[PDB]
Structures are given as structure tokens and as C-alpha cells.
């Protein structure tokens, strides 16, 4: 997972 704008996503 990576983080963008404070949230994690695949």
C-alpha cells in the first residue's frame, strides 16, 4: 500500500 492525502490505498 501507498499513502496519498493521508490515506492508504492499493
Amino acid at each position, epitope marked *: *500500500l501507498i*499513502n496519498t492525502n*493521508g*490515506s*492508504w490505498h492499493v
Partner: antibody
Amino acid sequence: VQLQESGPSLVKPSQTLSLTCSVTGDSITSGYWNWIRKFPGKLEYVGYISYSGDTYYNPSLKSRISITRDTSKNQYYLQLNSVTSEDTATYYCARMGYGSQPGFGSWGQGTLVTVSA
Amino acid sequence: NIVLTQSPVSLAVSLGQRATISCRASESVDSYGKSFLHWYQQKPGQPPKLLIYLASNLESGVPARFSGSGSRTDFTLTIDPVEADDAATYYCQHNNEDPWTFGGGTKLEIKR
């Protein structure tokens, strides 16, 4: 990896606080590169610049801050505008990994910035 | 807003005993089957040190006297055995979603 903060000890109210983090032993083109501060009393998250240059800021600071980087120097920077006595704190830079290592694993020693006339 | 409320504010423990500290989140800090809840030690004049990440994983280079458990909104840090070098403030912190926040700290006193 080693991180080291640098910047002024004293900043006057209403001025811009500018800090630098110098990273050695690893490239800032991987990982997440963060700023955190500790007030004289509380720890507060300030924000990051990612491995690809995208940023994430504390929403209560978004109107006053900017995090930028220089991948050729392996440095990243914090700009905080219009400082007040409420911005007096120890400022830290710290590395975060991705989803499998999402803690702040490596930290600089911190630098105390006082906002006063 | 996600508020992390630690308990107790402070505690005193004897050498060799098992110490447990709590962190209660106002809303779940889980996503993707992971709890984005981590624990740090901080001593005076030093930056915080990562002990446990993702609620229960020991940070490499930290001795295995620290462990963690929990999910969703309730988390525990265990120090076992307590040693004199554990005199410090312990913090939880999440990074599940905006805004990322820290707990207020639990001060650990070593009895002697």
C-alpha cells in the same frame, strides 16, 4: 539512514520559519519524509513530502505551510508562514516507509525554534 | 477527527514486572486488515523512538521487551520486563486517515 534538522533558533512573530532536513545514508526518492513538532508542554504531525514529491499537510496548518524538496541534495524543507508564540516547538524530521512499515522509523535529533520579539 | 486517548496518565512499575498502557481511538484506525497504530518512547532531549508499528510488530533494532496488541479502537502496549532504562513517556499515534494524530502520552515511573 540519518536525518538532521537545521534552521534558526529564534524567529520574530509574523515572520516565516524555514527549516531544512539533510538526509544521509538513503535517498529521499523512496519513502515518505515528514515533519513533526513537540510543543513545550504535546506532539503534532505537520506533514510529508512523498518519494514522488506529493505532499500531505495537517489540515489546521494547510493555509500556512509548504513542504518542498531537492532530490539532488537529498534535502527537504519546511516553510511555516506568519508564525506566533503558538509555533514555538521542537521540530523533527522523520522517515516513514510504505504500508508494511508505516511508523516513523528514523528521526532527526530535533531543533528548538522559539517565536519571540 | 480521530482522538487517541491514552490511559493511565502516569504509572509507577517495579523492575521485572509487566507494565501495560492503553490507547483508545475515537473511531477505528483500521484499513486494509491493518491497524495503522504505532507506539513510541520519548526521553528528555531526545526524539521519539519507534517501538511497535501496525499495532503488534516489533521495530527492528528494539529489544523484545516491548509488544503490542489490539485492533479497531482499543490498543495496548506491554513492557516486559520493565527495566530502569524504561523511565520515559510513551505515545501512541495513528496514520490511517486525515488527520494523523498522536496520543497525549503516558509517563512511566520506575519504582525503587
